[PDB]
RNA sequence: UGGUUGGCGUAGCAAAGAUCUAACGGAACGUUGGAUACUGGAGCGGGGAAGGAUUUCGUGCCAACGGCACUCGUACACGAGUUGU
RNA sequence: GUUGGUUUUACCCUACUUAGCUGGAAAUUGCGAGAAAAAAAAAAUUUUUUAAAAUUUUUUUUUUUUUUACUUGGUACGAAAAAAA
RNA sequence: GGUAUCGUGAGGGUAGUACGAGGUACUCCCAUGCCGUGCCUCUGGUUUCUGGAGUUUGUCGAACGGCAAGUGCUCCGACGCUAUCGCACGGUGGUUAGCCAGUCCCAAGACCAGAUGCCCA
RNA sequence: CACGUCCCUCUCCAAACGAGAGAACAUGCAUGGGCUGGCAUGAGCGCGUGGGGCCCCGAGGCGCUGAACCUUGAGGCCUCAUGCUGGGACU
């Protein structure tokens, strides 16, 4: 006898019914806090590693640089476009209603369509003309009265700005809409944060901050109808085995006289929703145009960019704000991953640690990439024939 | 003859192909799609299904037939693209627009009103199975018959 | 023709917002501007039919991307199916024709030895009503070549 | 820290040690909590029950202890520096961990030398 | 940035793997290699001098 | 004993590497050219015994048969054909 | 005691494992009517404000088009004019 | 009534575990093992990018370029996949370790008079 | 018939097939370039075992030459540059 192969609380292992990785539960509201947003949609870019000086009493690495992998997650600001209130009921939370923003970016209204550009594009057209009228202004006014009254939960309906993402590979132009809960103070305080913020952008740096952790939720990378050996980790059978090796030899017994829900079976692996915890935020990163010397740490002064030399493979440059957080993040490159405020206690000696990066890595992913910089590669090879066949042309002109 | 007499002999064209040597089950599927359709949209469905642009919704004679996305049109997941059966159907619909034309009727107002692929007497052939056995192979040719009134 | 007229209003949908935005950007270091680098406001396809239904395009077909990890002894036959699929997109023809010049080239290194690229000399012809004849365009090097419709 | 397991039971690592043992045959790894089919596996710094398979007969047929001081199976430092050896040899040692040799042959690993205060001293080098 | 034992490529903190030969140099017990190509090229005991992409090659030329 | 059935348009038709092209044909696979491979002389070569006995050949045909298809066939029909001191 | 000694079939049903589709609240019907809804409206239970004057006309407000603050191409408020309530 | 979007969450699943060292004999630390959930920056493995090179016999009259050897063979080899062979992570509350709730996973045949967008010939 | 959905078509974070995600004139696709990598110095002409009668034959070597080629394709990057640009079903 050995332990069971696989966690039964991650089950059924079925395809997620979404891809945007929506938060399942927001961290519990704390009135003592000032109001804030609790999550932020971001696009996985790729990974690198960083050097860091761990300064953790105990261990053999205190005061010693350690190479942590990091995931880079491009994070163009989300736009709030509507508030949502929930009222508690004996049967469970009910939306009171939502107040949509007076205006909606097309990328958002793209979301209500399968073919926006061959549509009449009438989405939020009556709201636009009605929220304008005093009749619809008083109606919007009444919804907020209902929030301030009957609500227990205020939530912004934010979305991603894919227009601003300018990624060439994330093909979506429908915005990634999602309610983002406002934990904070009294419901009027949450309404007020909610409505002042009701058509504004929301950068991650406001929601998060460095060294703080974030729970991540994104659908994990899809593997199709995976077999039982890859899906559950069961031992494959000895070579001599007949019908085939890669099987659970015994999927049941005489009784109960049927396969139980607990025996492992071939089927969908990957592309499951996951909430992974306590991912330290090694740096929030401002957009490359605004703060070009990303990845230029105090100890590595060369002006530099968070994106590797070949760009991120399959993704390309991170043109925007980026969250850089320790370790792996579930989901393939360029998937949209919601990442919430931590729901764990976060009073751990580790979790509270400030993270001063000593060296973001920027070598090519693609090959081994022994250069941190496109300038430095040229500084190795120096001029070569592509230039001499270039330099000569310039002289002739 | 025809299972159902046309409502108005002068206004309808009949067509038929006995002992059609296409599978009954595929032709059963292929002709039933057409049963209410206007002849031009039925000429069309076949020209399109002959291009793998649309599918014939297999319905009764599904079996462990494969899922397609072109079957959404028909309300179900299974669908299929007979070619031998789609061509015989066009070739029987040519037969009726010809029959419809001679009656002075206009083929492009004409509507399919009755399609009925009966299964025909079957042709024997032989397997040669494992340990010295000889099980049957049998084609299942269909009798397809139809008529198409034009509205008055 | 309401859609053609409606599409012209749809072109104005951008030109209305686009015209207003250009003036504001002119009023206000590597930041994107209308004159910075191409035109920021216009869509990618704003730059652009019934071309004479009789032309002779000449374009490189990068086969190797189109045959990567294909079964080796199926490479040539599908190099040829793909050169037709490649060219059917341009000529919009259901009736492409691969002349001996191009069949031999796809094949001259045998089934699996299919050349990395090919400079086809496709030509639509009037008369399967429109048909294309896909010739080879032998060349010492594919570098710096580009599709040249004529 | 973590050192990717290198020398499963049944392995014959060399004796780097001064002693007349020529090579060790790992028998089991001390501190090995076992999963079912998994073979116990010594890695760098690990104490190991080992019988000398070749060398002075006096050592030859009893189970002995031996820490692993180098390892062909490469491992990753927390420093992010994956590293490995030409060979993977251990040294004979007491259950206490005092080494019975008088001087180790080749280089000793950094995390051999840090777990074993005596091994570190006799080590010609640390790596 | 240690530089490779063979090609003398710059080898940054996350990259390459070290290798400790039994026949250590004392001075250089651990021999960094940027790449498997550099290590195999060393197991052949090729001198870096004749392999053109290495720096020791380019330096003499 | 005959017929019919569900399973089921399913299980399969996955051994021996392979076809591609144009032109023509045709109501729509063959034919030719080219290309490409294969057999690889203990051959998918050229002749014989046994055995088969018209399968030969031409024209036509393709209803049935050639487990897909055939415009083609060892199939079908018709006409031919085997020469000795 | 010794030695040598064919391990066949799921393509059915259910279980299960993933994967889809579609109905359905008199669980497909009845029209057989039950809401964890509210019981002139909104803002600070009561008070004040929101078309008017003789169906049409006039006035006011809001939105769209043209000529600073937001991540920085594209949307907001600026203005002015037109349309709708 | 369509279509679409955001959610609700009854119900069901459910997981973390162990060892050691430190520190002072609880707290508090710090590593590891196992388990589990991922991920692929690095490192290893994997090559049908038959990528690039080398190379053997046959072959293309030869060089070049190939080609055949069912991927000829050897070297290096990106993408990708993957390894406790790399790496990240594994949270609470309430009741009597259990147990229940939560977090976590599926979640309206739990038919959600929840919200919402659009059109309602 | 509206809104719209779907198919066909294109893309892939999806994928046995359905489903999914997206696109829907869009740097969308296509080539090309630049880059990031890979390999490792192409073709071609211009020191050397000896050999043949100052040249010729000569493996190898040198020089141009980190060259040549390959680099997104089951789907690296860059807008950098040019090229090419709806029908059907349903209610
Ligand atoms: Mg067996
Ligand atoms: Mg990489
Ligand atoms: Mg099947
Ligand atoms: Mg099927
Ligand atoms: Mg027999
Ligand atoms: Mg089958
Ligand atoms: Mg041969
Ligand atoms: Mg004959
Ligand atoms: Mg006969
Ligand atoms: Mg009803
Ligand atoms: Mg592409």
PDB file of N, CA and C in Angstrom, chain D residues 7-38:
ATOM      1  N   UNK D   7      22.663   8.562  -6.217  1.00  0.00           N
ATOM      2  CA  UNK D   7      23.280   7.266  -5.999  1.00  0.00           C
ATOM      3  C   UNK D   7      22.339   6.335  -5.296  1.00  0.00           C
ATOM      4  N   UNK D   8      21.422   5.749  -6.052  1.00  0.00           N
ATOM      5  CA  UNK D   8      20.412   4.850  -5.522  1.00  0.00           C
ATOM      6  C   UNK D   8      21.055   3.611  -4.966  1.00  0.00           C
ATOM      7  N   UNK D   9      20.381   2.944  -4.045  1.00  0.00           N
ATOM      8  CA  UNK D   9      20.901   1.705  -3.506  1.00  0.00           C
ATOM      9  C   UNK D   9      21.189   0.738  -4.631  1.00  0.00           C
ATOM     10  N   UNK D  10      22.329   0.071  -4.536  1.00  0.00           N
ATOM     11  CA  UNK D  10      22.846  -0.714  -5.634  1.00  0.00           C
ATOM     12  C   UNK D  10      23.971  -0.020  -6.370  1.00  0.00           C
ATOM     13  N   UNK D  11      24.176   1.254  -6.097  1.00  0.00           N
ATOM     14  CA  UNK D  11      25.242   1.987  -6.746  1.00  0.00           C
ATOM     15  C   UNK D  11      26.585   1.610  -6.170  1.00  0.00           C
ATOM     16  N   UNK D  12      27.627   1.704  -6.981  1.00  0.00           N
ATOM     17  CA  UNK D  12      28.972   1.525  -6.477  1.00  0.00           C
ATOM     18  C   UNK D  12      29.785   2.787  -6.689  1.00  0.00           C
ATOM     19  N   UNK D  13      29.693   3.703  -5.740  1.00  0.00           N
ATOM     20  CA  UNK D  13      30.533   4.880  -5.724  1.00  0.00           C
ATOM     21  C   UNK D  13      31.930   4.521  -5.270  1.00  0.00           C
ATOM     22  N   UNK D  14      32.917   5.272  -5.730  1.00  0.00           N
ATOM     23  CA  UNK D  14      34.308   5.055  -5.360  1.00  0.00           C
ATOM     24  C   UNK D  14      34.593   5.495  -3.944  1.00  0.00           C
ATOM     25  N   UNK D  15      35.608   4.932  -3.310  1.00  0.00           N
ATOM     26  CA  UNK D  15      36.060   5.484  -2.039  1.00  0.00           C
ATOM     27  C   UNK D  15      37.127   6.527  -2.266  1.00  0.00           C
ATOM     28  N   UNK D  16      36.787   7.778  -2.000  1.00  0.00           N
ATOM     29  CA  UNK D  16      37.745   8.852  -2.138  1.00  0.00           C
ATOM     30  C   UNK D  16      38.729   8.758  -1.004  1.00  0.00           C
ATOM     31  N   UNK D  17      38.373   7.954  -0.016  1.00  0.00           N
ATOM     32  CA  UNK D  17      39.020   8.002   1.280  1.00  0.00           C
ATOM     33  C   UNK D  17      40.425   7.410   1.299  1.00  0.00           C
ATOM     34  N   UNK D  18      41.172   7.829   2.313  1.00  0.00           N
ATOM     35  CA  UNK D  18      42.545   7.414   2.585  1.00  0.00           C
ATOM     36  C   UNK D  18      42.647   5.908   2.787  1.00  0.00           C
ATOM     37  N   UNK D  19      41.568   5.328   3.298  1.00  0.00           N
ATOM     38  CA  UNK D  19      41.510   3.930   3.712  1.00  0.00           C
ATOM     39  C   UNK D  19      41.727   2.981   2.545  1.00  0.00           C
ATOM     40  N   UNK D  20      41.841   1.696   2.846  1.00  0.00           N
ATOM     41  CA  UNK D  20      42.105   0.707   1.823  1.00  0.00           C
ATOM     42  C   UNK D  20      40.875   0.238   1.073  1.00  0.00           C
ATOM     43  N   UNK D  21      39.713   0.782   1.408  1.00  0.00           N
ATOM     44  CA  UNK D  21      38.533   0.550   0.593  1.00  0.00           C
ATOM     45  C   UNK D  21      38.781   1.131  -0.776  1.00  0.00           C
ATOM     46  N   UNK D  22      38.436   0.387  -1.817  1.00  0.00           N
ATOM     47  CA  UNK D  22      38.626   0.857  -3.177  1.00  0.00           C
ATOM     48  C   UNK D  22      37.366   1.470  -3.731  1.00  0.00           C
ATOM     49  N   UNK D  23      36.231   0.876  -3.400  1.00  0.00           N
ATOM     50  CA  UNK D  23      34.959   1.452  -3.784  1.00  0.00           C
ATOM     51  C   UNK D  23      33.842   0.995  -2.872  1.00  0.00           C
ATOM     52  N   UNK D  24      32.821   1.823  -2.754  1.00  0.00           N
ATOM     53  CA  UNK D  24      31.701   1.521  -1.892  1.00  0.00           C
ATOM     54  C   UNK D  24      30.540   1.006  -2.700  1.00  0.00           C
ATOM     55  N   UNK D  25      29.793   0.091  -2.117  1.00  0.00           N
ATOM     56  CA  UNK D  25      28.545  -0.364  -2.692  1.00  0.00           C
ATOM     57  C   UNK D  25      27.397   0.088  -1.826  1.00  0.00           C
ATOM     58  N   UNK D  26      26.671   1.111  -2.256  1.00  0.00           N
ATOM     59  CA  UNK D  26      25.602   1.632  -1.425  1.00  0.00           C
ATOM     60  C   UNK D  26      24.554   0.578  -1.163  1.00  0.00           C
ATOM     61  N   UNK D  27      24.203   0.440   0.109  1.00  0.00           N
ATOM     62  CA  UNK D  27      23.274  -0.574   0.564  1.00  0.00           C
ATOM     63  C   UNK D  27      21.982   0.058   0.946  1.00  0.00           C
ATOM     64  N   UNK D  28      22.092   1.183   1.626  1.00  0.00           N
ATOM     65  CA  UNK D  28      20.929   1.985   1.910  1.00  0.00           C
ATOM     66  C   UNK D  28      21.341   3.346   2.387  1.00  0.00           C
ATOM     67  N   UNK D  29      20.415   4.280   2.283  1.00  0.00           N
ATOM     68  CA  UNK D  29      20.677   5.654   2.602  1.00  0.00           C
ATOM     69  C   UNK D  29      20.053   5.996   3.932  1.00  0.00           C
ATOM     70  N   UNK D  30      20.867   6.460   4.864  1.00  0.00           N
ATOM     71  CA  UNK D  30      20.376   6.807   6.180  1.00  0.00           C
ATOM     72  C   UNK D  30      19.384   7.943   6.064  1.00  0.00           C
ATOM     73  N   UNK D  31      18.348   7.926   6.889  1.00  0.00           N
ATOM     74  CA  UNK D  31      17.368   8.987   6.843  1.00  0.00           C
ATOM     75  C   UNK D  31      16.410   8.864   5.681  1.00  0.00           C
ATOM     76  N   UNK D  32      16.340   7.687   5.080  1.00  0.00           N
ATOM     77  CA  UNK D  32      15.462   7.487   3.944  1.00  0.00           C
ATOM     78  C   UNK D  32      14.072   7.052   4.347  1.00  0.00           C
ATOM     79  N   UNK D  33      13.157   8.002   4.445  1.00  0.00           N
ATOM     80  CA  UNK D  33      11.764   7.631   4.454  1.00  0.00           C
ATOM     81  C   UNK D  33      11.390   7.118   3.081  1.00  0.00           C
ATOM     82  N   UNK D  34      10.666   6.009   3.026  1.00  0.00           N
ATOM     83  CA  UNK D  34      10.445   5.353   1.756  1.00  0.00           C
ATOM     84  C   UNK D  34       9.047   5.454   1.202  1.00  0.00           C
ATOM     85  N   UNK D  35       8.939   5.841  -0.065  1.00  0.00           N
ATOM     86  CA  UNK D  35       7.717   5.619  -0.809  1.00  0.00           C
ATOM     87  C   UNK D  35       7.789   4.195  -1.301  1.00  0.00           C
ATOM     88  N   UNK D  36       6.702   3.677  -1.863  1.00  0.00           N
ATOM     89  CA  UNK D  36       6.600   2.261  -2.171  1.00  0.00           C
ATOM     90  C   UNK D  36       7.713   1.741  -3.065  1.00  0.00           C
ATOM     91  N   UNK D  37       7.607   1.849  -4.376  1.00  0.00           N
ATOM     92  CA  UNK D  37       8.610   1.184  -5.194  1.00  0.00           C
ATOM     93  C   UNK D  37       9.941   1.895  -5.205  1.00  0.00           C
ATOM     94  N   UNK D  38       9.953   3.142  -4.756  1.00  0.00           N
ATOM     95  CA  UNK D  38      11.139   3.969  -4.860  1.00  0.00           C
ATOM     96  C   UNK D  38      12.326   3.327  -4.166  1.00  0.00           C
TER      97      UNK D  38
END
